[PDB]
């Protein structure tokens, strides 16, 4: 209950899927052309059984100029531009890309994937063979659960490009209006009646970010899977609005324990769906809450779990 960084240690039994950042670190070592080929390979195979949802119209508008610029290049330049993004080179295209929210980056690559499939953007060279390190990285990816697979792909996409400056322009999709109160569903969590946890889940499922943020302490933090804590209401609300639209949280069961100084620690396990895959991918998730004596959220961590065997009382 003293520091955000120490609260990171609550529920230390929770086995997170650290194969995801491990695999991202291996991927990030590879030659840029192998990075592009590997994801092409993974994308094609995954597309045999899982269809990515189409990017939103606003997103496509925001990426359109950059996409047109690439589409106007000769093939060798197209390949160089994509390598620039993978290498995190400092170029105008890489700076534009870095200014984008994850969803806009994902929609940019969604479009390039379609154009490569159609032959209008320089495809991976025919008969391309991955490097020794890259073939093993792909093998690991293809052995993971789909929820882990899609998280590796997102993290590879978000990592590309070049950030120059701390207070650089941030481009994101417009904020969706919250769900009308009448049509809202309420979660049920075995073992957990805590109103702050239930209101957390219900407000996020309704895209009601202004209500959600009011659950937090001023200095409170939210820790997304495999990322550092996002600290204080402005940064956490920013994150909700830019990155947390149209999720479906399906918490199942939890446990509630006292913590030092009248705090309460609560662990919930369940599933989450991203709007990119809808009901076809259910990620296995834990939430770890540290609530102050008044019930506000001092800290919440969201963990991608190593296996369904990490869900409480499987
Ligand atoms: C790149 C590339 C390509 C294309 C690649 C493409 C098109 C790849 C596309 C990949 C896509 C669309 C991946 C989407 C992933 C989404 C995830 C993991 C969302 C998780 C959300 C969670 C867990 C949120 C949970 C949350 C909960 C519960 C909270 O309680 C609080 C909020 C929080 C957010 C934390 C080509 C194919 C063209 C080849 C070349 C190449 O490189
Ligand atoms: Cl998402």
Numbering used by the authors: 2 to 315
The study reports:
Orange Carotenoid protein (OCP) is the only known photoreceptor which uses carotenoid for its activation. It is found exclusively in cyanobacteria, where it functions to control light-harvesting of the photosynthetic machinery. In the active state, following OCPR (red state) binding to the cyanobacterial light-harvesting antenna, the keto-carotenoid dissipates excess absorbed light energy through non-photochemical quenching (NPQ), a vital process for cyanobacterial survival in turbulent waters.
The I1 dataset with 1 min illumination reveals s-trans to s-cis CAN isomerization along the C9’-C8’ single bond concerted with s-cis to s-trans isomerization along the C7’-C6’ single bond (s-BP isomerization) as the early step of activation (d and below). As a result, C8’ = C7’ changes its orientation. The refined coordinates obtained from extrapolated structure factors identify the CAN s-BP isomerization after 1 min of illumination at the experimental light intensity as a first light-activation step. In the I1 structure, no changes of coordinates are observed for W110 compared to OCPO but the Y44 sidechain undergoes a rotation by 31o. As a result of Y44 rotation by 31o in NTD in the I1 state, the distance between the hydroxyl group of Y44 and the C9’ carbon reduces by 2.0Å, redistributing charge-density around C9’-C8’. Leucine L37, which has been proposed to play an important role in OCP light-activation, does not undergo any significant movement upon illumination. We therefore conclude that the s-BP isomerization of CAN in I1 causes rearrangement of the CAN β2-ring binding pocket in the NTD, which is mediated by contact with Y44. The salt bridge rupture between R155 and E244 is already observed in I1 and increases the distance between residues E244 and R155 by 1Å. We complement this knowledge by showing that salt bridge rupture between R155 and E244, the important precursor of NTD and CTD separation, occurs in the first illumination step (I1) and is controlled by a hydrogen bonding network involving protein-bound water molecules. The I1 structure is the first example where s-BP isomerization of a carotenoid carbon chain regulates the activity or the biological function of a protein.
